[PDB]
Ligand binder design. Structure first.
Ligand SMILES: [Mg+2]
Ligand SMILES: [Mg+2]
Ligand SMILES: [Mg+2]
Ligand SMILES: [Mg+2]
Ligand SMILES: [Mg+2]
Ligand SMILES: [Mg+2]
Ligand SMILES: [Mg+2]
Ligand SMILES: [Mg+2]
Ligand SMILES: [Zn+2]
Lengths: 81, 129, 87, 150, 185, 208
RNA sequence: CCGGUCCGCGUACUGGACCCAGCCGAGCCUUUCCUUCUGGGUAGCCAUUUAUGGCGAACCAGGACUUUUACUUUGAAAAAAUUAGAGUGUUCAAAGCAGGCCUUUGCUCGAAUAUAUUAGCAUGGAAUAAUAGAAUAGGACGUUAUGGUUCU
């Protein structure tokens, strides 16, 4: 392809690129509001969390760190902030 | 490591122009790169180019129009006396009637013809034709 | 190229590629000259009245000639929404 | 890349273009600071405090909220460690390898790795002396290293 | 006139301060208009019959204005019709030292001309946040900035932007174009 | 630009899909990427026949620009396309090259069937590689019917279609013949039904 | 833009550009000024007591300070011979620095000019590449800010 709009790449193909290979690098992670099933308390949790986050009320582990995104425990619902 | 961002910029421009592409992406940007491109743009060897701010060194997208034969840096940026400018244009330029040697002088970045007009000299920076 | 008195001492002002602006040499036998007929409002091809493009042998060798014509023809109205600037 | 390897990995963090706090962030620039000091007394290094902040408190960057980087805040409250954290972990690993080497004398691989870590210590300690983070007479001693980290 | 932090305020500044001593009548926003002050009211004429009103504020006082600026502008636009109201902080620009210039204290980056023009370019579009800036270098020689704004809170500025371009041109002399790439369109 | 009477009509669009023209090869080269609309879950690539139609109209306009109709050479080495090119030459006056292409027909001027076409039209760049190669020696532009796996080297006008279909080849050739005659004025207008049927131009086995 | 003239594209000369644009500059304004000291000296501010109250920048001449370089412009300096090079019928030339005038009880062009180059000296500029600065503030201004401790 000799002629191509480098300043306005297709947003579909722009999203398949590596996170450092976009026009402006941008994280694909986000922060979430996590509802444990046991109670209702807003707890902001990083999507790629490295910590076994526990809610303040009861000392129950909410998520377990993995290689990539943290895994929410069963009964825990997330909403992207 | 990355020792000359101007060399990276001109190599990308050369590779895109030799391969027939009409646009090229340059990373990283700098003041010297932008002022080098403005001289090339001023003589018509390239078209409009665009600077993208990413809160970092930056990126540039240059539009090529096929008139550029070759642009390059001179590393290191040798000191050039006024009497030595004649010798440099003979070695680097294809003829005595066209082509420009880019210098960095205390009066600013300019072509060898402009440097003779304002009677200034500095360090050699590159060439374009 | 002309002398001081202004006479064009140049013989053979050469053609240039429509895609890459390279000079098409005298022995570049991979270079072609596309001739595309003009069509009147009745749907008829107008005899001897054409839109013309030239491609150097370099562009054709890389296989980009087809995509270059898509771009060149779309800018001239010969085509609609077939070539996209953004990929 | 990779000063002491043949690797060419590029994995790292990619900061967002926005330098401002997210609209949904409600904590003040103070409440984060008292949170940092509370965690700093538990013994966390600046790397670990930042990990906990985004992992459990939604603090994407301490700089976009407070205005200063994490190590700058600790040094402003007299909580800066004497040895910088990264230099500490290189010396601690070298201590661990040296402790392993005296019991496994034929482990020539650990001997090769120890030279890399100590070379990395000396380059970093020399840098810290030019920026006046370490005293000009500061020198890393293998014999007395266990005192500094243990 | 106590609201004005300048000696000999103009009639326009008095009228604006007269509005400032009237919006606290409703107690929803009153606990914060006592300390609010401003230094100047620069007004220019934009095309289309409108007029740009620039309120200049001490930079340390900027974060106090930012807390109520969204509401306060809407009623100030009601009191003064066909007026576009913006709030700018009076940042100080320190000139670049010459080589032979006598040594002064090291110039902080917030006082540099690049930072200040970037800063006023940020105060101009306050409800929205900048997600990207581009600079075109045209073949003619002139340079044009492009600023990309977030679609969130876009309705506060989406009918202006043209006032901003001329206002930015008045303050700095350079050309800028504001675009919101992610609108519904 | 172009009158709206030249737009893709629903009748022709029905023909193209029924002839499996829209079925492109599983693997697509980078040069044919703009012509792919979407990949079908089995693996076949769906051809954007709107783009296919416009290339056909563009190609027919180039053919109409050649003064001598016999100077246009239509080629097919595939057996599926041999009948199509022979009938195209009869209707349009072009020069058909069915079956084997003798190497040197364009460069060796003492061969028997030594031709000098002003334009060469190819059914498939892969099976007609020899015909395409010599055109790049004597400044001959090439129009080619290309699948998603067909090479694009030295091809100026690419018609995106299914090269490996019995009905796809015949239909595309039939469409070109109709448009060339419409521009020449043989067909009175773009709405008159053509006498010739797309069944002619279709390859017939020795069984019948 | 009369090319008259000067000595026939001629076109040099040169009245005359009305300067199209372009090029080398200089200041002033945009938040942007050698912080200065001692006069001239005071002219106009703040002219209510002037060039009898408080515009030292309203430009000089006599003092006081100064982040360090590299680089590049210009200047002085780098002996003569040699080199390049202007002039000059040593009969030409290599050379030489001679020589020329109506014929002289004497008149009279000259004997240029360039180049040196690392180092040193003075100088304009401030791109490029370094360097220093305000972080436990021991930081900067108060022109006439208030004292105190010392020292000349
Ligand atoms: Mg031009
Ligand atoms: Mg050479
Ligand atoms: Mg030249
Ligand atoms: Mg050129
Ligand atoms: Mg790398
Ligand atoms: Mg190494
Ligand atoms: Mg990293
Ligand atoms: Mg109230
Ligand atoms: Zn819970």
């Amino acid at each position: 392809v000799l002629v191509q709009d480098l300043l306005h790449p297709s947003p579909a193909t722009e999203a398949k690129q590596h996170k450092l290979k976009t026009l402006v690098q941008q994280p694909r992670s986000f922060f979430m509001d996590v509802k444990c099933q046991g109670c209702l308390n807003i707890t902001t949790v990083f999507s790629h969390a490295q910590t076994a986050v526990t809610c303040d009320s009861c000392s129950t582990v909410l998520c377990t760190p993995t290689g990539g995104k943290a895994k929410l425990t069963e009964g825990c619902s997330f909403r992207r902030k | 490591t990355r020792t000359s961002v101007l060399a990276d910029a001109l190599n990308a421009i050369n590779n895109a122009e030799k391969t027939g592409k009409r646009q090229v992406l340059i990373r990283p940007s700098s003041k010297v790169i932008i002022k080098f491109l403005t001289v090339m743009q001023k003589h018509g060897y390239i078209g409009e180019f665009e600077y993208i701010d990413d809160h970092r060194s930056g990126k540039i997208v240059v539009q090529l129009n096929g008139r550029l034969n070759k642009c390059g840096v001179i590393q290191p940026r040798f000191n050039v006396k006024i009497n030595d400018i004649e010798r440099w244009t003979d070695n680097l330029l294809p003829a005595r009637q066209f082509g420009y040697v880019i210098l960095t002088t205390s009066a600013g970045i300019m072509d060898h013809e402009e440097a003779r007009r304002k009677h200034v000299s500095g360090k050699i920076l590159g060439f374009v034709y | 190229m002309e002398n001081d008195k202004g006479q064009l001492v140049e013989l053979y002002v050469p053609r240039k590629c429509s895609a890459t602006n390279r000079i098409i040499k005298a022995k570049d036998h991979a270079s072609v000259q596309i001739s595309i007929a003009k069509v009147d409002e009745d749907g008829r091809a107008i005899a001897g009245e054409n839109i013309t493009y030239a491609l150097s042998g370099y562009v054709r060798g890389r296989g980009e000639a087809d995509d270059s014509l898509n771009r060149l023809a779309q800018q001239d109205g010969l085509l609609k929404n077939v070539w996209s600037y953004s990929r | 890349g990779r000063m002491h390897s043949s690797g060419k990995g590029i994995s790292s963090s990619a900061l967002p273009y926005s330098r401002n706090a997210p609209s949904w962030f409600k904590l003040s620039s103070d409440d984060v600071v008292e949170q940092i000091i509370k965690y700093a007394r538990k013994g966390l290094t600046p790397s670990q405090i930042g990990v906990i902040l985004r992992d459990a408190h939604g603090v994407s960057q301490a700089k976009v909220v407070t205005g200063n980087k994490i190590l700058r805040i600790l040094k402003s409250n007299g909580l800066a460690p004497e040895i910088p954290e990264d230099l500490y972990y290189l010396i601690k690993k070298a201590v661990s390898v040296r402790k392993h080497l005296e019991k496994n004398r034929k482990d020539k691989d650990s001997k090769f790795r120890l030279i890399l870590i100590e070379s990395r210590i000396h380059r970093l300690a020399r840098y810290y002396r030019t920026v006046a983070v370490l005293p000009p007479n500061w020198k890393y001693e293998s014999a007395t290293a266990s005192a500094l980290v243990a | 006139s106590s609201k004005i932090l300048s000696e000999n305020p103009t009639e326009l500044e008095l009228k604006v301060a007269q509005a400032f001593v009237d919006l606290e009548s409703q107690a929803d926003l009153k606990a914060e208009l006592r300390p609010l002050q401003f230094k100047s009211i620069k007004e220019i004429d934009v095309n289309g019959g409108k007029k740009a009103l620039a309120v200049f504020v001490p930079p340390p006082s900027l974060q106090a204005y930012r807390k109520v600026q969204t509401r306060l502008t809407r009623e100030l636009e009601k009191k003064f019709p066909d007026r576009h109201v913006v709030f700018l902080a009076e940042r100080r620009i320190l000139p670049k030292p010459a080589r032979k210039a006598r040594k002064q204290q090291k110039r902080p980056r917030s006082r540099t001309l690049t930072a200040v023009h970037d800063k006023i370019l940020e105060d101009l579009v306050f409800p929205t946040e900048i997600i990207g800036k581009r600079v075109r270098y045209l073949v003619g020689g002139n340079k044009i900035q492009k600023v990309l704004l977030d679609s969130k809170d876009s309705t506060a500025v989406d009918y202006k932007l043209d006032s901003f371009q001329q206002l930015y041109s008045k303050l700095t002399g350079k050309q800028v174009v504001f675009e919101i790439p992610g609108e519904s369109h | 630009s172009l009158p709206a009477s030249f737009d893709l009509t629903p009748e022709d669009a029905k023909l193209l899909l029924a002839a499996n023209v829209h079925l492109g090869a599983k693997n697509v080269q980078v040069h044919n990427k703009p012509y792919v609309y979407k990949t079908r879950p089995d693996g076949m690539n769906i051809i954007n026949i709107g783009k296919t139609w416009e290339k056909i109209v563009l190609a027919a306009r180039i053919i109409a620009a050649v003064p001598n109709a016999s100077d246009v050479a239509v080629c097919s080495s595939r057996t599926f396309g041999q009948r199509a090119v022979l009938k195209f030459a009869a209707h349009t006056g072009a020069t058909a090259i069915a079956g084997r292409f003798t190497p040197g027909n364009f460069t060796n001027y003492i061969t028997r069937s030594f031709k000098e076409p002003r334009l060469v039209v190819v059914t498939d760049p892969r099976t007609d590689a020899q015909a395409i190669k010599e055109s790049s020696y004597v400044n001959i532009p090439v129009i080619a019917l290309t699948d998603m796996d067909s090479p694009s080297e030295y091809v100026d006008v690419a018609i995106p279609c299914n090269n490996k279909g019995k009905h796809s080849i015949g239909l595309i050739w039939w469409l070109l013949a109709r448009e060339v005659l419409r521009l020449r004025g043989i067909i009175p207008d773009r709405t008159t039904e053509w006498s010739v049927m797309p069944d002619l131009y279709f390859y017939r086995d020795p069984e019948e």
